[PDB]
Design a binder for this molecule. Structure first.
Ligand code: 9O9
Ligand code: 9O9
Ligand code: 9O9
Ligand code: 9O9
Ligand code: 173
Ligand code: 173
Ligand code: 173
Ligand code: 173
Ligand code: MG
Ligand code: MG
Ligand code: MG
Ligand code: MG
Lengths: 326, 326, 326, 326
């Protein structure tokens, strides 16, 4: 959120491109923003705002905002403290932090920071190794398993191909693949008491099947435009998906959230909470832990401002706002 | 209306930005104009135009045009004569002038200019002080209380933050805050016989509740894009709101009105009248009282021209025009 | 149709602006083109094209194309031969030519060129003088009275105001105003056996009333964007109007026709024929009579090409084509 | 697919324009791309991808991808090996190749390359010569007759007119016209056992009549924007056409396909397969046979990538994907 310039200044171009890029022609990356910009909120007036609160309860825990840090791999690419800097700032802000399967600091180290860590799973070739990663995350105190379900394999990121981009030798997968199926979801659900959250759902019937499968939540998402190029933005499917699950699981959304007003739009369309990816990495690149803290404080102020201006004393009230496309 | 250049020439940049700016990304500021530009009128032909009149009756009084000067705070920012220059030109044009709570000349001085002064209220922390301001306005001969209902607090105007903009010491609140609620509306309605007009309504159910609450009018408005960034333009809610109140109160609109054709569009969508904000301040900056007089004469000619070209001998006929979105 | 550059090269700027301009912000001028560009034809294949003909019968006479030259005042502004050059080229092409009330050569001189002259009427202050002009036109052999019904007064053409544009002394109204009403239409209809064609109809109920009033035709038109700024383009009202009159009169359209493909679009939306204004004046400015001849030959080839490519052996078949908005 | 630059580098400008251009204002050429860009796919997740296959069965034969090389005349314009280079690369990729009536190498030479040759027919003035060409194609082992039905005559390609473009003397119609009708279709169908595929259908009723006429397939197509300027893109008619024929023939589409994601969009809208024209010629110009091979390998990888990311193990599954317009 205007820290993007600072991050472009400091990062090597090919790392900036790894962060910023999408797959193919980047149509789905651009559409995430276009779709949000077409949504207008219809605010309410003259309601009691004596106790405006941005807090929510999600997956058994209070969060300070309806927002979590999205899983983004290899955060030491952006700053030497990598995941620890981001997790510390998230903890201090009361925001859940999603630890990656491909984190550049081990999941146990990040969980020891405290806060509310979730763990994002990629399915390994091996049910047994997959479930061992889930068990590690649970043993370390992670509070939810965010199972990424839109990466049978990685999308074609043409910026990275044009750059011949590769992991610097000083960045590794500190926790150390086969396509996940509904059978994999069931194996995870049977082996943990943590809520299983399926990230990357766009079809209404997949959202309904996720509830039937025992998911505790879904993230309506086209993976920041990095997977199928031409995949619909999650924000365009969110309202239909929220209606189809009719309260059967938490429904989160991501893709393009860049302000507290955008958070308000997502909640007015029915989201329980959003994920935020690239902006958190911009803040990390620009100023480390303190950069991420400042970003989360700015987003917190913007969310409180937008809610009150729209007559909403709580996130639940914001979910009852109506919208109009423009 | 092309006086904007002259105003940019003369004003200090940070004052020009205070006037021109909106909140956040300015999406709602831009949308006010985009929304008007999508409306096309379907004109009628061959009707009697022997006595074309732009006059309306509103809040017990004749007005020369279906237009009033919007409340804009601190008009000495734009010209040394500030509010007195604008109120004199409005009086001479037969246009109501809305005196601000944050006027830079006292409300009694502006009311003494004559004309048809309305008074815009911000709710004070203190029902008693709020009602004393209403009583001052009524004692001074103001004809309507325009209660602003979309500012529980001021929006985030990033131009002003980037400029570190502050009131020059030579500008003060010459009449000298807590969020207004429906209880505040009732307190005002019980304490005045003047029509109470709620400015900043966008939701249909808030317009219906305003009628139920005893409002004499509403202004369908997103506050010139200065409050919630992402709030729908008033012009996009106007037709639905006019249908929902079904004549129970006057329905005004503002945001982006820049020509007599725009006034015609608003009336064809059902508005009783419009407010005009920034253009009046451009005229004031460019040429003081005579600048505002010339602006109002130009708008008067454009409204008469547009009405007649659309076959409308009266504003009521213009409200029966149909429109098409393009 | 790419002769516009040549015309801009040769004409004085203020005359070019008189020709090219619209009223107000020119929104309706631009919308005439935008609206045509959104229409796509659904062509038919494999039909018999052995005898493709672009001819139509209109107002009792065969025309070589479904097109007439629109009334454009003061054509000596564009070329020394003015109206005679255009009328000669129209005659030779088999296209009707509309003589203006404000022609710069007398209506009797232009009618003597031959061809199929129509006469465009502006209502004079005086029913008697108005009807005398109609009688002159009929005596001279004009075949239709094109009564302009969208000019109670002239629109505000800001290019001309900025230019301080006035008629050169070498251009006069060689045939030598009060707002026309439905009473005026009836006076004309009672005083001529020629078909009366009302030019400037946009509302469906005005098209139905025109049939009830005894009009032989209407021109669905916003006057090339020169009258009400913000008036809907005629092409956007054409289909609804054609359905409402259900064959009760001829329905023509104008505004922005710049190719034979555009003629095909208008006919697929239901027009009996189009008028063409500015392009004919470009051709006249660029190369006089021979310029207009070349323009009409190009339009004739483009209309025949478009019809055949869309599977239409006749203009009637083209009116049965379907369209899709894009 | 980014080989377009290389082709522009090497080809003479007027040959590049012959390849790239459309008719008229090129509205239909541009719309082919705009229309695809508005389509978003709704991908499915968590399905079995153990045996993803891009193969289809069409006109009695397996094809490696749901794609064929479109008929493009005079390929020696782009490279000295012309049609033989393209047909060899198509054969090696398992893609059908459409031999043109106006090929610059004889149809028997191209068919002898092997692979799966189809033959595109233009109707000759002479049923007997037309049917002799069909018999030549069948005798040579072509597997389908692609009867072009949208060229009663060639469209007006203004780039070629402005260039005064003509065939170099070193390029000839190595196989050596009157408008085709439904009678011509029947003559072809009665004289061959090969499937007859009507290329250039856009109207729903023409697609239904094609099935009734005994066509084995249709290509929903506006001829790459080269025939009627203003013709709807095929991709905008495809879904309605697929529903109307309800499995009665194969339904192909072309126009603007530039990636495997675009192939996925076409199949999600119901196409059995696509044709690809200009990109194959870019590859041929840039690098001959090996250029076309590399293009087809890239398209094959992109189609497999897009299918799997959208949860589709087969092309049939991709046809059951839903889409949303954006
Ligand atoms: C560099 C980068 C790496 C990853 C790695 C992962 C990952 O190992 N697992 C996963 O499940 N999602 C990922 N993502 C998607 C992310 O979690 C959000 O879906 C989008 O970034 C939301 O959009 P923005 O807020 O970024 O627009 C990534 C996004 C970016 C930019
Ligand atoms: C500098 C500036 C100050 C104020 C202060 C106030 C205010 O103390 N009370 C209120 O109730 N409305 C205000 N407004 C909104 C105004 O009354 C109109 O809502 C919009 O200006 C209509 O849009 P434009 O005609 O300007 O597009 C302002 C608008 C501008 C530009
Ligand atoms: C310079 C100029 C003068 C006139 C004078 C007249 C007029 O004395 N009577 C009338 O009834 N219509 C007029 N018109 C409108 C014209 O008849 C067509 O309605 C539009 O030009 C159609 O649009 P284009 O083909 O020009 O887009 C004019 C148009 C132009 C440009
Ligand atoms: C230079 C050029 C020549 C021809 C000659 C023919 C032809 O003798 N017969 C036919 O039946 N279609 C043709 N076409 C259309 C082609 O078959 C495809 O319909 C479009 O090229 C699809 O669009 P793109 O993939 O090109 O967008 C051509 C296209 C181009 C560009
Ligand atoms: O999932 C991703 O989007 C991503 O960019 C990525 C790249 C490498 C490893 C893991 C994730
Ligand atoms: O209400 C407003 O929009 C506004 O700009 C303002 C700013 C300072 C004081 C009062 C109003
Ligand atoms: O009718 C017109 O549009 C027009 O431009 C005009 C101007 C002067 C005289 C007559 C018509
Ligand atoms: O069919 C075509 O589009 C085309 O361009 C063409 C041109 C010359 C000969 C054959 C086809
Ligand atoms: Mg996001
Ligand atoms: Mg306004
Ligand atoms: Mg026209
Ligand atoms: Mg194609």
């Amino acid at each position: 959120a205007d820290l993007e310039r600072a991050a472009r200044d400091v990062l090597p171009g090919e790392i900036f491109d790894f962060l910023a890029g999408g797959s193919g022609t980047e149509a789905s990356l651009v559409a995430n923003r276009t779709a949000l910009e077409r949504v207008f909120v219809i605010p309410r007036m003259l309601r009691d705002l004596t106790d405006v609160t941005t807090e929510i309860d999600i997956f058994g825990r209070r969060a300070a905002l309806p927002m979590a840090v999205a899983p983004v791999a290899y955060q030491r690419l952006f700053h030497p403290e990598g995941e620890l800097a981001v997790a510390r700032a998230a903890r201090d802000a009361g925001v859940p932090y999603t630890i990656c399967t491909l984190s550049s600091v081990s999941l146990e180290e990040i969980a020891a920071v405290g806060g509310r860590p979730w763990f994002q799973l990629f399915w390994l070739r091996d049910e047994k190794r997959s479930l061992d990663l889930v068990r590690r995350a649970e043993d370390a105190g992670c509070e939810a398993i965010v199972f990424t379900v839109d990466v049978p394999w990685m999308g074609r990121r043409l910026r990275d191909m044009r750059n011949g981009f590769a992991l610097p030798e000083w960045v590794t997968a500190a926790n150390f693949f086969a396509p996940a199926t509904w059978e994999s979801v069931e194996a995870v659900r049977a082996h943990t008491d943590l809520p299983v959250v399926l990230k990357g759902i766009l079809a209404v019937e997949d959202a309904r099947r996720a509830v039937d499968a025992g998911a505790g939540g879904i993230v309506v998402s086209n993976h920041g435009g990095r997977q199928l190029d031409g995949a619909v933005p999650g924000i365009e499917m969110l309202g239909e998906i929220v209606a189809a699950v009719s309260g059967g699981c938490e429904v989160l959304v991501d893709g393009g959230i860049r302000s507290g007003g955008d958070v308000l739009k997502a909640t007015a369309l029915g989201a329980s909470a959003v994920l935020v990816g690239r902006p958190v990495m911009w803040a990390l690149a620009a100023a480390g832990q303190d950069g991420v803290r400042q970003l989360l404080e700015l987003l917190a102020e913007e969310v409180r401002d937008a809610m009150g201006l729209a007559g909403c004393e709580s996130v639940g009230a914001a979910r009852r706002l109506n919208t109009k496309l423009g």
